[PDB]
Amino acid sequence: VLVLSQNTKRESGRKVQSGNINAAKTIADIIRTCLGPKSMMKMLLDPMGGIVMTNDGNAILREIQVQHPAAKSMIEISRTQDEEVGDGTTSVIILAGEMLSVAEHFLEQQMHPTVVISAYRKALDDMISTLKKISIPVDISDSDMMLNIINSSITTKAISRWSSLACNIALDAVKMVQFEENGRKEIDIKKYARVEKIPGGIIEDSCVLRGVMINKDVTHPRMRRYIKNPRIVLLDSSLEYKKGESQTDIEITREEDFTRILQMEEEYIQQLCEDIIQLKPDVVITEKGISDLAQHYLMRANITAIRRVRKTDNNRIARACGARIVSRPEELREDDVGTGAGLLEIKKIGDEYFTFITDCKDPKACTILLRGASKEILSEVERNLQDAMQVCRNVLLDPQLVPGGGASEMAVAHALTEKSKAMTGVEQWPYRAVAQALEVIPRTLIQNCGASTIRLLTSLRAKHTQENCETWGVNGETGTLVDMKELGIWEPLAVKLQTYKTAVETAVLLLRIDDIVSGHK
Amino acid sequence: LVVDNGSGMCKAGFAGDDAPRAVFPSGQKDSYVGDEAQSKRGILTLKYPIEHGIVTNWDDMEKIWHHTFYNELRVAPEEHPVLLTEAPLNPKANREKMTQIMFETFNTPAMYVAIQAVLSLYASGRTTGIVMDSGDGVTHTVPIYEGYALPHAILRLDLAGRDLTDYLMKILTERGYSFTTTAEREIVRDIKEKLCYVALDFEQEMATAASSSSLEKSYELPDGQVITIGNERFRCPEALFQPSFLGMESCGIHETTFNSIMKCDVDIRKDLYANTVLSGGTTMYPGIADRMQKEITALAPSTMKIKIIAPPERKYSVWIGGSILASLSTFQQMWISKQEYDESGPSIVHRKCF
Amino acid sequence: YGRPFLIIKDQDRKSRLMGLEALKSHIMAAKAVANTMRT
Amino acid sequence: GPLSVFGDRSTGETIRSQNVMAAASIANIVKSSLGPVGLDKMLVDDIGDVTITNDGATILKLLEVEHPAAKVLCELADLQDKEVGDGTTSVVIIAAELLKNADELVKQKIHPTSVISGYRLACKEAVRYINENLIVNTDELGRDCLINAAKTSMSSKIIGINGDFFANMVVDAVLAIKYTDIRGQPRYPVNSVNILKAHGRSQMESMLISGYALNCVVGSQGMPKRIVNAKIACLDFSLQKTKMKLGVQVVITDPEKLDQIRQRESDITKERIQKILATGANVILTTGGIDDMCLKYFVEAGAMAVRRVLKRDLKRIAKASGATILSTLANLEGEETFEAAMLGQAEEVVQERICDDELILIKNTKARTSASIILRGANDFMCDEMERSLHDALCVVKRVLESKSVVPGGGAVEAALSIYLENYATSMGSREQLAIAEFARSLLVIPNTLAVNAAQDSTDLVAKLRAFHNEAQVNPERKNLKWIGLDLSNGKPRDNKQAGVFEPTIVKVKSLKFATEAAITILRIDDLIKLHPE
Amino acid sequence: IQDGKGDVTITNDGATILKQMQVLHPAARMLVELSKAQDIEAGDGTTSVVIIAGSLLDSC
Amino acid sequence: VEKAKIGLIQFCLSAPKTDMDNQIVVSDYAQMDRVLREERAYILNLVKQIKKTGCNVLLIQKSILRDALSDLALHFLNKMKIMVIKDIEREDIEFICKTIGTKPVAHIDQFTADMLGSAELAEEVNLNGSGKLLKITGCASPGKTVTIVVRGSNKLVIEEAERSIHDALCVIRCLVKKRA
């Protein structure tokens, strides 16, 4: 009597939608305390079988495998937000879950999803309109305010105690990978700002080198290790007789070609190295193999040779030393011999030798010296560094700032609550609803402490009404009503605007689910 | 990294996985951004640089390796010990050449690799027993005792299933309708994979297929015809056993196996007598096992006993062996790592001692 | 139907024949028994 | 005796009903997915691939169906998508209810031949009446009727709320590739506007490009990323290390030539490069790989070179910029030269970053324009949803523009045809008149499904529309009532022009033709033998 | 006629129908070959010839 | 293309290669240069022969083991505005030759301009995203074979229609066989 494959399972109704909202909860409850300057650390077991300790949304969730694929959907939006602007992922997740909770209070009374979505559209419209109406600028012309924003960002992070320190370690690294080509398109490539971490050392040892630091070593004892102005060239050819791509097996008939062939290969190496010796070099690095005949030749001329280097490191060194990578030693030009490095440095940071290319002119690609006590520690510091560079870049492309810690978000809740009553229509109830949902933001911040949330909430809600005192938030370490104009907490507008749009839209899209099927290919 | 450059494939998963996640054919995300589309299609263009059991090219292998686990496997090998496969036999030159490239472009902490025969033996669940490595193009004998392959005990024989098919089509001209074209080579191989069994022997099989003609199987195929009296089927295995069929008159493979076992001390041969498992590559049909059993029993003293072992599926056997060895929990004692690579280079790999 | 069910307990364990062809079945035996005794 | 069939034969109406059962089971399962109030259906693949889908064909295609007639309906839905692309869900429902009516009718003991002939003739009369008695003008609209068509497309889709920007975007995109086929009528290169997508910030953050954006990026940062003026050199020749011929072997007894042959392996490539680089080349597009030799040369020249370039996109861009397809430099004879008279024309090319990744982007291919849309969304699944939505919308609008004819919908056509055909069907007065009556009745499902998906009082509105159409038809004095349909925005009988709800006539014609075809096909099926499986 | 394979055939011509039954009884195979021969000779509506043959058998 | 002088070719078009084994050995760069230039020259010589024969549309049969089409051939034909169709069946030669008039040649020397089949119109049709065909119409040579197309919403309806039409043709073959 059957019709389709027996593996079919179709379900629908309000019950599965409610199950989806409870899944949203069961995600939202996992992260409810890692928010704000006062945070409570969280550890996770890596799905591959490792260990990880983080306190930001996606980094927590990106290492989480789930069933009931809606949880996968929120993991997807978490990764999207993280790679999108790079902060407040926990904020987006908790907002989405709680405001879905609020919307469920509205769906259950026979109401249709469509009117809810229309209210969602009007709500986000008003949110962005008033945010632009409230977004204020700031001049990007100082160390003061930039380091203040860095402090305000990483106060929610563990490196808050070294904030100013980290500030500088961030700031320098930004200014010396910043590059611009062809009279336009200034670029800040974090990949060129390569991160490296070294065992041992103190936390304060962290710094960005005005040059390039690499994990290699010289390739012969004779080649000296100290050069003040390196005549470096960027080789992209293997040091051996070229094979090419043609077929093989020339036919040997006589006794005067074999050793002749060996000698002609030796002389080919001779010429290939001679065209390099000509330009008076100091050091040479290559991405491929090196022949002993060639190293002997460069030894005769006192030149320094380096074996294979990573292509990303190759490009970074090309940016640093001002040389142009060439794969044609026999077509070498005087145009692109590297010059601009402050010192050749061959040291042993630890027990593995490193090469430290200190530079003397404006570089475009760094290696960051990092010192700590465990790979976990250095990894956490790494994540803090990406947060720092991303937020600094956002400020570089946004002269505007909006206070964090819960002030402007209460303010916009109030503003849109006022805006709701102007029109006439039941749609104001779902619309205004999201603002009520918005009121979740400070709760956790207080709930991270355990203070009397009700009085603080009512006080802030009132204060944001008279004389538009829309600048007051909570001092997280104290959990006390304060004005953000003095505490010094500010975040780039990009992160929170992204939070707005992403949370509202995922709320829009998670409502459209009513019917589900499983068991198919 | 449980990547394994097999006979023609590379299979990438993890040690704990039940299988590799990706294959190596030598538009998942290809409609979102296309970043990896170009890289993967370019790597796809590059060919397989391994033939006859010896490495033949080197730039392409690293070219493929870079992409294959930097764009889908999503792994940093700097934080991982490495476990690949290799061609069945090579001198130390290729090993110490591959070490250089691996380190100089990846700098991975540690390494260990092993001969495919060892991986197959592990997959079958044995640490002992010589396996008949009847690989494509060429076959080899690898007597394994406790796991390590003896450098003094590997024999190589040039027989191949390609050669068997060619010799069949060299005596299929005597069958009337010969077969030589690509389609005809394919149909000869298809019939071979359908029926080329062994009962006991040549003349007695031919008698029962011609005198009584009761070994006939009519071929009702779009690409085939009823042209086999039961002769050609059995005519594939016979040259597999008796060299003079092919015109290259030499000793039998059984002779090579027997000598490669006898040159060692008799006691250890007992353990080699224990399993004596086989491997495919040119053999897929039954009748092989008991026939070679009795054939070498003629060469085996009646005072001692011999066993024949042949699993039906051995397709990921090297991968199974690799996964097992990755969890052996003692193989790290034999890892060759940076502590020796940066100290001695390739000299220790050469076994300067002894 | 959209989903399988059963109205009869062991509905797939009992057979059901009908129609004029069903008569044929009886008539089938109607040969043998008669053909049994005609002798 | 017992049949030698060795199989299983079911007779009577059972299998008929079973077809009905099949036509039942899937139908309502996809029922919830068309119309301005169709809600999404979630599908979880066995490998954990959760999906969002609302158009019927995409819904069904991944279901595994073993019942034969249900499979037939499956490919019926697939074809309804592949030629039309709209009404993606309606057709299976229409056919299902048609089968319901037919099988019930035969259960009341009527000859199948009469009803089958009724099916054929009714299909013909219905298509005819659609042709004559609903003619209106689309030249009263234009550049805005396309907007309304896109609105009707997105009605059930995910972006039905933000149509103001997107519809203008898509209509301008259509105008950007508008071609001519027979030199008197327009032509559209379907699937020649690449819609490359990104997990962006929001639906409002997608932008349309008056140009072209590959899935490709600059090969290395050594090349300049913004060429001032674009003279494009498209290639199909593989630029790898040149190999002469697969059937040549070298035999050398004089080693002096030997090393020089090593030179040749480069020279040829190198030489053509100079030729390639002689004409002031700006950008190099090749399907073949590019190696360090060419990379270094192009860096020295500052001209972009991209490998693994696809083929169809390359043809599109070469045509758009006026560039030409090249596989070798040989001219009408053995002379292999490069000509500067065919270089592609464009303003500039940039490796723009969209969200966190860069890609090649072409600016304003000269002498014309081109269309490509960068879909940025909150994630991948919903962005694929816009992908499908906009593909369907472009299919609808290309159907509209190919044949400039359209009629209002939302049951307007449904109710009008039902009223006609029910008040018609006196031309035979026979066993087939009841058939035509059941045709007029069976179209009641479309208002029924729309109302149930909108929670409207179906009977009141259907009675109002039917009464207006009936009084218009039988009393053509106030024929204005024939210009009225049903809109689910507020459950209103309205002139379906202010909303713009408008659908091509050929769509209804074609869907009706295949629906009646399959219905007849099944109604001339009466017995089944289930042969024993192998 | 639904075959054991993944196909299906709507059919009306008698020879076709007779063919798709892969029965084991000789009499039906004889009828199948008769229908084949008739289609080779005439070609149309071999549904009748089987009925005629069976009716003659019943009469005899 | 309209009023095209259609050409059919059945022999190998690929690089000069003997039926029997060989290998062209190159001993220096100059020999490589001559090999390249003479390969180009031979190919263009052939293409110029066919173009000089007044041909308009080319037809290539199917083959294995050094097949009969080259990319350079397509580039030449595009440079001279010529169609081509490749990889056609063996026993269909009679149908095509009788229909169009072009006759098969296994060698360029026997290829002649008089042996061009002239059809009024060779056009490619679309099936609304369901493939592209090539219908040959207005042939000047007397063809004694005809073809007919069938379409339908599925494959079984067209199967039944095909069997019905085949049996109708059998009806008429018996009708003309003898007249009663």
From Swiss-Prot, chain A:
Entry's Gene3D superfamilies?
GroEL, GroEL-like equatorial domain, TCP-1-like chaperonin intermediate domain
Which InterPro entries does this one have? Chap_CCT_gamma (IPR012719), Chaperone_TCP-1 (IPR017998), Chaperonin_TCP-1_CS (IPR002194), Cpn60/GroEL/TCP-1 (IPR002423), GroEL-like_apical_dom_sf (IPR027409), GROEL-like_equatorial_sf (IPR027413), TCP-1-like_intermed_sf (IPR027410), TCP-1_chaperonin (IPR053374)
What CDD domains does the database record attribute to this sequence?
TCP1_gamma
* Reaction catalysed by this enzyme: ATP + H2O = ADP + phosphate + H(+)
Q: What is its EC number?
A: 3.6.1.-
**Which positions are annotated as binding Mg(2+)?**
87
What residues does ATP bind to? 36, 88-90, 405, 476, 491
Residues involved in ADP binding: 36, 88-91, 156-157, 405, 476-477, 491, 496
Q: Which residues carry this modification: Phosphoserine?
A: 5, 164, 237-238, 246
Name positions with the PTM N6-acetyllysine. Answer: 216
Where are the Phosphotyrosine modifications? 241
Q: Which UniProt keywords apply?
A: Acetylation, ATP-binding, Chaperone, Cytoplasm, Disease variant, Disulfide bond, Hydrolase, Intellectual disability, Isopeptide bond, Nucleotide-binding, Phosphoprotein, Ubl conjugation
Q: Which residues carry this modification: Phosphothreonine?
A: 424, 453
Query: Which stretches does the entry tag as region Disordered?
Result: 1-18
The record's subcellular location field reads: Cytoplasm
One GO cellular component term, please give it. Answer: cytoskeleton
GO molecular-function terms, A-Z: ATP binding; ATP hydrolysis activity; ATP-dependent protein folding chaperone; protein folding chaperone; RNA binding; unfolded protein binding
Q: Which cysteines are joined by disulfide bonds?
A: 360-366
- Cross-link Glycyl lysine isopeptide (Lys-Gly) (interchain with G-Cter in SUMO2) mapped to chain: 9, 242-243, 375
Q: Where does the record locate the signal sequence feature?
A: none
Q: Could you give the subunit structure recorded for this chain?
A: Component of the chaperonin-containing T-complex (TRiC), a hexadecamer composed of two identical back-to-back stacked rings enclosing a protein folding chamber. Each ring is made up of eight different subunits: TCP1/CCT1, CCT2, CCT3, CCT4, CCT5, CCT6A/CCT6, CCT7, CCT8. Interacts with PACRG. Interacts with DNAAF4. Interacts with DLEC1.
Question: Would you identify the family this protein belongs to, as annotated?
Answer: Belongs to the TCP-1 chaperonin family.
Q: Which gene encodes it?
A: CCT3
Curated annotation (Swiss-Prot), chain C:
Residue(s) of cross-link: Glycyl lysine isopeptide (Lys-Gly) (interchain with G-Cter in SUMO2) = 9
Q: Which residues carry this modification: Phosphoserine?
A: 15
Q: According to its UniProt record, where is this protein located?
A: Cytoplasm; Cytoplasm, Cytoskeleton, Microtubule organizing center, Centrosome
Q: How is it modified after translation?
A: Ubiquitinated by the DCX(DCAF12) complex specifically recognizes the diglutamate (Glu-Glu) at the C-terminus, leading to its degradation.
**Induction record:** Down-regulated in response to enterovirus 71 (EV71) infection (at protein level).
Biological function: Component of the chaperonin-containing T-complex (TRiC), a molecular chaperone complex that assists the folding of actin, tubulin and other proteins upon ATP hydrolysis. The TRiC complex mediates the folding of WRAP53/TCAB1, thereby regulating telomere maintenance. As part of the TRiC complex may play a role in the assembly of BBSome, a complex involved in ciliogenesis regulating transports vesicles to the cilia.
Related illness:
Neuropathy, hereditary sensory, with spastic paraplegia, autosomal recessive: A disease characterized by spastic paraplegia and progressive distal sensory neuropathy leading to mutilating ulcerations of the upper and lower limbs.
Q: Which family does it belong to?
A: Belongs to the TCP-1 chaperonin family.
The protein's name is T-complex protein 1 subunit epsilon
The source organism is Homo sapiens
Which part of the full protein is shown? 12 to 50 of 541
Curated annotation (Swiss-Prot), chain D:
What GO molecular-function term can you cite, just one? unfolded protein binding
The leader peptide range reads none
Its EC number(s): 3.6.1.-
**Keyword set for this entry?**
Acetylation, ATP-binding, Chaperone, Cytoplasm, Cytoskeleton, Disease variant, Epilepsy, Hydrolase, Intellectual disability, Nucleotide-binding, Phosphoprotein
Residues that the record marks as modified (Phosphoserine) are 4, 489
Q: What class of enzyme is it?
A: hydrolase
Per its UniProt entry, which superkingdom is the organism in? Eukaryota
Q: What is its main location?
A: cytoplasm
Q: Which residues bind ATP?
A: 35, 87-89
Which cell locations does it reside in? Cytoplasm, Cytosol; Cytoplasm, Cytoskeleton, Microtubule organizing center, Centrosome
Q: Which residues carry this modification: Phosphotyrosine?
A: 179
Reaction(s) catalysed by this chain, per the record, are:
ATP + H2O = ADP + phosphate + H(+)
Annotated GO CC locations? acrosomal vesicle; cell body; centrosome; chaperonin-containing T-complex; cytosol; extracellular exosome; Golgi apparatus; heterochromatin
Identify the residues that bind ADP.
Answer: 35, 87-90, 156-157, 410, 503
Q: Which family does it belong to?
A: Belongs to the TCP-1 chaperonin family.
Entry's disease: Intellectual developmental disorder with polymicrogyria and seizures: An autosomal dominant neurologic disorder characterized by a broad phenotypic spectrum. Main clinical features are developmental delay of varying severity, intellectual disability, seizures, and polymicrogyria. Additional variable features are non-specific pyramidal or cerebellar signs, and visual impairment.
Q: What is this protein called?
A: T-complex protein 1 subunit alpha
Q: Which organism is it from?
A: Homo sapiens (Human)
Q: Tell me the name of the encoding gene.
A: TCP1
From Swiss-Prot, chain F:
The modified positions for N6-acetyllysine read: 48, 62, 79, 86
Write out the annotated subcellular location. Answer: Cytoplasm; Melanosome; Cytoplasm, Cytoskeleton, Microtubule organizing center, Centrosome; Cytoplasm, Cytoskeleton, Cilium basal body
Query: Of which family is this protein a member?
Result: Belongs to the TCP-1 chaperonin family.
The subunit structure is:
Component of the chaperonin-containing T-complex (TRiC), a hexadecamer composed of two identical back-to-back stacked rings enclosing a protein folding chamber. Each ring is made up of eight different subunits: TCP1/CCT1, CCT2, CCT3, CCT4, CCT5, CCT6A/CCT6, CCT7, CCT8. Interacts with PACRG. Interacts with DNAAF4. Interacts with DLEC1.
What the protein does comes down to:
Component of the chaperonin-containing T-complex (TRiC), a molecular chaperone complex that assists the folding of actin, tubulin and other proteins upon ATP hydrolysis. The TRiC complex mediates the folding of WRAP53/TCAB1, thereby regulating telomere maintenance. As part of the TRiC complex may play a role in the assembly of BBSome, a complex involved in ciliogenesis regulating transports vesicles to the cilia.
Under which name does UniProt file this protein?
T-complex protein 1 subunit delta
The species this protein was found in: Homo sapiens (Human)
The root-end lineage is: Eukaryota, Metazoa, Chordata, Craniata, Vertebrata
